[PDB]
Enzyme design. Structure first.
Site, PDB file in Angstrom:
ATOM      1  N   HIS A 116       0.819  -1.206   0.000  1.00 25.37           N
ATOM      2  CA  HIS A 116       0.000   0.000   0.000  1.00 25.37           C
ATOM      3  C   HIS A 116       0.855   1.259   0.000  1.00 25.37           C
ATOM      4  O   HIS A 116       1.876   1.324   0.689  1.00 25.37           O
ATOM      5  CB  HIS A 116      -0.924   0.010   1.213  1.00 25.37           C
ATOM      6  CG  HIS A 116      -1.958  -1.070   1.196  1.00 25.37           C
ATOM      7  ND1 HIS A 116      -2.077  -2.002   2.203  1.00 25.37           N
ATOM      8  CD2 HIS A 116      -2.935  -1.357   0.302  1.00 25.37           C
ATOM      9  CE1 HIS A 116      -3.077  -2.820   1.929  1.00 25.37           C
ATOM     10  NE2 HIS A 116      -3.614  -2.451   0.780  1.00 25.37           N
ATOM     11  N   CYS A 119       0.654   9.049   0.708  1.00 25.18           N
ATOM     12  CA  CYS A 119       1.380  10.294   0.494  1.00 25.18           C
ATOM     13  C   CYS A 119       1.980  10.759   1.813  1.00 25.18           C
ATOM     14  O   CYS A 119       1.529  10.357   2.888  1.00 25.18           O
ATOM     15  CB  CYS A 119       0.472  11.369  -0.107  1.00 25.18           C
ATOM     16  SG  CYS A 119      -0.729  12.097   1.022  1.00 25.18           S
ATOM     17  N   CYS A 216      10.040  24.395  34.415  1.00 23.28           N
ATOM     18  CA  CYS A 216      10.121  25.519  33.490  1.00 23.28           C
ATOM     19  C   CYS A 216       8.818  26.308  33.511  1.00 23.28           C
ATOM     20  O   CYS A 216       7.862  25.926  34.185  1.00 23.28           O
ATOM     21  CB  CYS A 216      10.438  25.040  32.071  1.00 23.28           C
ATOM     22  SG  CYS A 216       9.067  24.218  31.223  1.00 23.28           S
ATOM     23  N   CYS A 262      24.417   0.293 -30.260  1.00 21.80           N
ATOM     24  CA  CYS A 262      24.550  -0.820 -31.196  1.00 21.80           C
ATOM     25  C   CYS A 262      23.359  -1.776 -31.165  1.00 21.80           C
ATOM     26  O   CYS A 262      23.273  -2.685 -31.992  1.00 21.80           O
ATOM     27  CB  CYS A 262      25.841  -1.592 -30.921  1.00 21.80           C
ATOM     28  SG  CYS A 262      25.766  -2.708 -29.509  1.00 21.80           S
ATOM     29  N   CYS A 272      20.035  -2.219 -10.572  1.00 18.60           N
ATOM     30  CA  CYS A 272      21.124  -1.337 -10.979  1.00 18.60           C
ATOM     31  C   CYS A 272      20.865  -0.735 -12.358  1.00 18.60           C
ATOM     32  O   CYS A 272      20.538  -1.452 -13.304  1.00 18.60           O
ATOM     33  CB  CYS A 272      22.452  -2.093 -10.980  1.00 18.60           C
ATOM     34  SG  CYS A 272      23.888  -1.067 -11.336  1.00 18.60           S
ATOM     35  N   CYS A 277      27.469  -2.709 -22.258  1.00 21.08           N
ATOM     36  CA  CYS A 277      27.329  -3.409 -23.528  1.00 21.08           C
ATOM     37  C   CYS A 277      28.411  -4.469 -23.713  1.00 21.08           C
ATOM     38  O   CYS A 277      29.598  -4.180 -23.573  1.00 21.08           O
ATOM     39  CB  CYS A 277      27.369  -2.419 -24.689  1.00 21.08           C
ATOM     40  SG  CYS A 277      27.228  -3.203 -26.306  1.00 21.08           S
ATOM     41  N   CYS A 282      31.519  -2.114 -29.474  1.00 19.97           N
ATOM     42  CA  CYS A 282      30.772  -1.023 -28.860  1.00 19.97           C
ATOM     43  C   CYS A 282      31.193  -0.808 -27.412  1.00 19.97           C
ATOM     44  O   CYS A 282      31.880   0.163 -27.095  1.00 19.97           O
ATOM     45  CB  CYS A 282      29.268  -1.295 -28.927  1.00 19.97           C
ATOM     46  SG  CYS A 282      28.250  -0.027 -28.139  1.00 19.97           S
ATOM     47  N   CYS A 287      23.010   4.247 -19.016  1.00 24.11           N
ATOM     48  CA  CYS A 287      21.965   4.199 -18.004  1.00 24.11           C
ATOM     49  C   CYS A 287      20.690   3.572 -18.555  1.00 24.11           C
ATOM     50  O   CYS A 287      20.148   4.033 -19.555  1.00 24.11           O
ATOM     51  CB  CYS A 287      21.670   5.604 -17.483  1.00 24.11           C
ATOM     52  SG  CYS A 287      20.356   5.684 -16.240  1.00 24.11           S
TER      53      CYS A 287
HETATM   54 ZN   LIG Z   1       9.140  21.847  31.776  1.00 23.77          ZN
HETATM   55 ZN   LIG Z   2      26.498  -1.510 -27.720  1.00 21.39          ZN
HETATM   56 ZN   LIG Z   3      -2.721  11.039   1.073  1.00 24.23          ZN
HETATM   57 ZN   LIG Z   4      20.335   7.948 -15.826  1.00 31.12          ZN
HETATM   58 ZN   LIG Z   5      -0.985  -2.715   3.787  1.00 34.29          ZN
END
Ligand SMILES: [Zn+2]
Ligand SMILES: [Zn+2]
Ligand SMILES: [Zn+2]
Ligand SMILES: [Zn+2]
Ligand SMILES: [Zn+2]
Ligand SMILES: [Zn+2]
Ligand SMILES: [Zn+2]
Ligand SMILES: [Zn+2]
Length: 306
Positions: A116, A119, A216, A262, A272, A277, A282, A287
């Site tokens: 799940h 946000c 305090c 290539c 990763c 290559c 080549c 990435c």
């Molecule tokens: Zn306190």
């Molecule tokens: Zn290549």
């Molecule tokens: Zn939310």
């Molecule tokens: Zn990248």
């Molecule tokens: Zn859950």
């Protein structure tokens, strides 16, 4: 920009920020450790001495890599590091939040079977309300934490720095959880202000508590630990795992590629992003995500992604 790492910057940001991944030789602590292979998962960068490589320092026999993260939203000093929050990720698949159903990014992905997502705004409120209502879960060896908001089994958060999202004041209270729990079962209260933290024994009928040996000068509310107020506490607090099932079903988080130069099939290694290559004419290093040749930006922003 594709960010696969998120940290909590304690300052000057005081919030969750995209993180920059860094590596150094664990022996001489210089940024001269060249990796035989790049990291493919969180264990590779979080567990000591998981990965090996070559140190380019003049007279260093260093082999082991040492990873660390830094906040990317501003200049950081050499040792100004931040803790990585591996449960947090870019919401590239546009999953709705399990609580508010809004599409937000980044999101926290629980380790429950349903994975799940939630946000950060909702996760913040979730932690704050459980903290105030003393509904954190005790795990013997870990401390105090929270599972998935749906109450799924085996979803208890293990990296407790994720609760930094409480905010600095509430997180300080969270660090006092065991002590406050002991004072509470005793019919007492713990002073909320960090510099004090005095144990107080108020009148059992009185809701206002004055930090008055030597305390305090702070009057606060017994129920919400906030500066004392008239009438009711925050509505989110006196309102005390009921989740919308449709919203919870929606909120779930659910091999080669040809070389860009290539077009020979290149095998991905785990999560990763570093591709190499095999074609001898080549031999492009590139990435997986960006399709460009490998460089320091891809290394820092998304060396791997899981
Ligand atoms: Zn306190
Ligand atoms: Zn290549
Ligand atoms: Zn939310
Ligand atoms: Zn990248
Ligand atoms: Zn859950
Ligand atoms: Zn920062
Ligand atoms: Zn070295
Ligand atoms: Zn109150």
């Amino acid at each position: 920009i594709y960010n696969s790492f998120y940290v909590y910057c304690k300052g000057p940001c005081q919030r969750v920020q995209p993180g920059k991944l860094r590596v150094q030789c664990s022996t001489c602590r210089q940024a001269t450790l060249t990796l035989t292979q790049g990291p493919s998962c969180w264990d590779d960068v979080l567990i000591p001495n998981r990965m090996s490589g070559e140190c380019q320092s003049p007279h260093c026999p260093g082999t082991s890599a040492e990873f660390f993260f830094k906040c990317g939203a501003h200049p950081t000093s050499d040792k100004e590091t931040s803790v990585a929050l591996h449960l947090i990720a870019t919401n590239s698949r546009n999953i709705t939040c399990i609580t508010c159903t809004d599409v937000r990014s980044p999101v926290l992905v629980f380790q429950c079977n349903s994975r799940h997502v939630i946000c950060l705004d909702c996760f913040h409120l979730y932690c704050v309300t459980r903290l105030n209502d003393r509904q954190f879960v005790h795990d013997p060896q870990l401390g105090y934490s929270l599972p998935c908001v749906a109450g799924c089994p085996n979803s208890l958060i293990k990296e407790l720095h994720h609760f930094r999202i409480l905010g600095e004041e509430q997180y300080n209270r969270y660090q006092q959880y065991a002590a406050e729990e002991c004072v509470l079962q005793m019919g007492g209260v713990l002073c909320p202000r960090p510099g004090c933290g005095a144990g107080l024994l108020p009148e059992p009928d009185q809701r206002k508590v004055t930090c008055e040996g030597l305390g305090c000068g702070f009057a606060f509310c017994r129920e919400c630990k906030e500066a004392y107020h008239e009438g009711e506490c925050s509505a989110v607090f006196e309102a005390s795992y009921r989740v919308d099932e449709r919203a919870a079903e929606q909120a779930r988080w659910e091999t080669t590629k040809p070389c860009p130069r290539c077009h020979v099939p290149v095998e991905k290694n785990g999560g990763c992003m570093h591709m190499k290559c095999p074609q001898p004419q080549c031999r492009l290093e590139w990435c997986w995500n960006c399709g460009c040749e490998w460089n320091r930006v891809c290394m820092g922003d998304h060396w791997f992604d899981v």
